[PDB]
């Protein structure tokens, strides 16, 4: 789940499902290279030491979702936020839900730069066959990525890495396809589609 | 003043099994609530049990029968073990202290009540992989660049190594510009792989050459390769 906002804006946060039963919620805090800290416990209570600048929503009655605010957004707020969810009803989880990735601009918007490589006459021989995909440049840091043969969706052999930051705050990404080389000659194309906010890129490759 | 620090073996060949450890710094160990919790680079935090001197000790019914906690009064300590381990327990492993609360929603005597847990101080983590595999060296192939911006694309796919990690350059570190290297995936076989990049000036194709030097150490292997258009 991917957000962005301007330093002295106001964030809006939501999480998991609607309630059945009374709640107890939790609310958690992830920067890059660190353990969760603790923002938020019993719906609306705050532990000492957390600015007044974060909030969020008492537990009235069924129906309803959890939500986070921040006012006045600093730049040290750039985090993934997390809750933990107890309800009389449906019982304990004991995964987190997600909120979302939350980016502070610094700096214009940027598209991602694809690459796409057919696989090499060499690696043929050897039996094997794959296709590679490569991202770079893009900002925020959050993209999705599909692959597609001919004109149908693939998903059964596919790995695709995590973003990482390049040294100039831009970040970059990689996805592998794995095929027998029979599938490789008995379909008339292969597509490679990223997705970054809401636009789309696309590139395609040939056996010929 | 209070202060965890969590200590771990780093790479398990698993017919073994894991233990960890926590040292816990200001305050006694039977005072307390203590939990233990694990992530996977891009997943979300997942919760693993707790223990109280007492007794009342619970687990996630995702591991429950393979993972048990103990205290020890002398070193004050918690500690983790686990058996029957696969590839899908590698993670970071996190210990903390969890402090207890009740939420009241009627009258008691009709049990409108619960108990809940929440997190206040946490220590930094160990990483822990699983893997049953032999070490091996890479595979290097060619990624061709198309004779069809004003500037072409080309490089090296590392195939198939173990363990991490891998060096790589350009004809031996006198190109450093344009060069993308990427971090890598593990396939569903154990091994690893990566790929390396650069983007040139496609009026220059007929006259340079370009060579890659992979370099693995666990494996005492070194490959030059010379990519080529076609
Ligand atoms: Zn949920
Ligand atoms: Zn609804
Ligand atoms: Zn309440
Ligand atoms: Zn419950
Ligand atoms: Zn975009
Ligand atoms: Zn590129
Ligand atoms: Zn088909
Ligand atoms: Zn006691
Ligand atoms: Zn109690
Ligand atoms: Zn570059
Ligand atoms: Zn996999
Ligand atoms: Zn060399």
């Known amino acids: 789940s991917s957000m962005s906002v301007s330093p002295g804006e106001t964030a809006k946060i939501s999480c998991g499902k609607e309630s059945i039963g009374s709640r107890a919620v939790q609310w958690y805090q992830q920067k890059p290279g660190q353990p969760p800290s603790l923002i938020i416990y019993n719906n609306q209570d705050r532990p000492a030491g957390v600015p007044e600048r974060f909030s969020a929503s008492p537990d009235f009655r069924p129906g309803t979702t959890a939500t986070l605010t921040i006012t006045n957004v600093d730049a040290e707020d750039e985090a993934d936020y997390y809750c933990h969810i107890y309800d009389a009803r449906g019982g304990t989880n004991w995964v987190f839900d997600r909120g979302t990735t939350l980016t502070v601009l610094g700096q214009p918007k940027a598209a991602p730069s694809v690459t796409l490589f057919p696989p090499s006459s060499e690696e043929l021989q050897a039996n094997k066959a794959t296709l590679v995909c490569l991202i770079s440049d893009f900002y925020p840091g959050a993209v999705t990525v599909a692959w597609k043969a001919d004109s149908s969706p693939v998903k059964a052999g596919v790995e695709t890495t995590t973003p990482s930051k390049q040294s100039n705050n831009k970040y970059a990404a990689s996805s592998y396809l794995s095929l027998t080389p029979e599938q490789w000659k008995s379909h008339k194309s292969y597509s490679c589609q990223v997705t970054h906010e809401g636009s789309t890129v696309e590139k395609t490759v040939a056996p010929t | 003043q209070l202060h965890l620090q969590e200590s771990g073996p780093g790479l398990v060949k698993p017919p073994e099994t894991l233990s960890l450890t926590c040292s816990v710094s200001?305050?006694?160990?039977?005072?307390?609530?203590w939990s233990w919790i694990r992530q996977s680079p891009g997943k979300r935090p997942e919760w693993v049990g707790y223990?109280?001197?007492?007794?009342?000790?619970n687990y996630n019914p995702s591991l429950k029968r393979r993972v048990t906690f103990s205290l020890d009064t002398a070193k004050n300590e918690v500690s983790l073990k686990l058996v029957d381990l696969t590839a899908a327990d590698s993670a970071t492993y996190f210990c903390?202290?969890?402090?207890?609360?009740?939420?009241?929603?009627?009258?008691?005597?009709?049990?409108?009540?619960?108990?809940?847990?929440?997190?206040?101080?946490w220590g930094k983590g160990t990483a822990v992989t699983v893997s049953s595999a032999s070490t091996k060296g890479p595979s290097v192939f060619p990624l061709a660049p198309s004779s069809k911006g004003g500037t072409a694309a080309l490089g090296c796919l590392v195939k198939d190594y173990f363990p991490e990690p891998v060096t790589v350059s350009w004809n031996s570190g006198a190109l450093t510009s344009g060069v993308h290297t990427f971090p890598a995936v593990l396939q569903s076989s154990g091994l690893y792989s990566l790929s390396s990049v650069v983007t040139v000036p496609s009026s220059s194709l007929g006259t340079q050459t370009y060579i890659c030097n992979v370099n693995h150490k666990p494996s005492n292997t070194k490959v030059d390769k010379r990519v080529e258009p076609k």
């Open positions: 200001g305050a006694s160990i039977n005072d307390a609530y």
């Open positions: 903390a202290r969890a402090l207890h609360g009740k939420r009241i929603y009627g009258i008691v005597a009709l049990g409108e009540l619960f108990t809940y847990f929440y997190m206040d101080v």
């Open positions: 223990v109280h001197h007492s007794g009342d000790t």
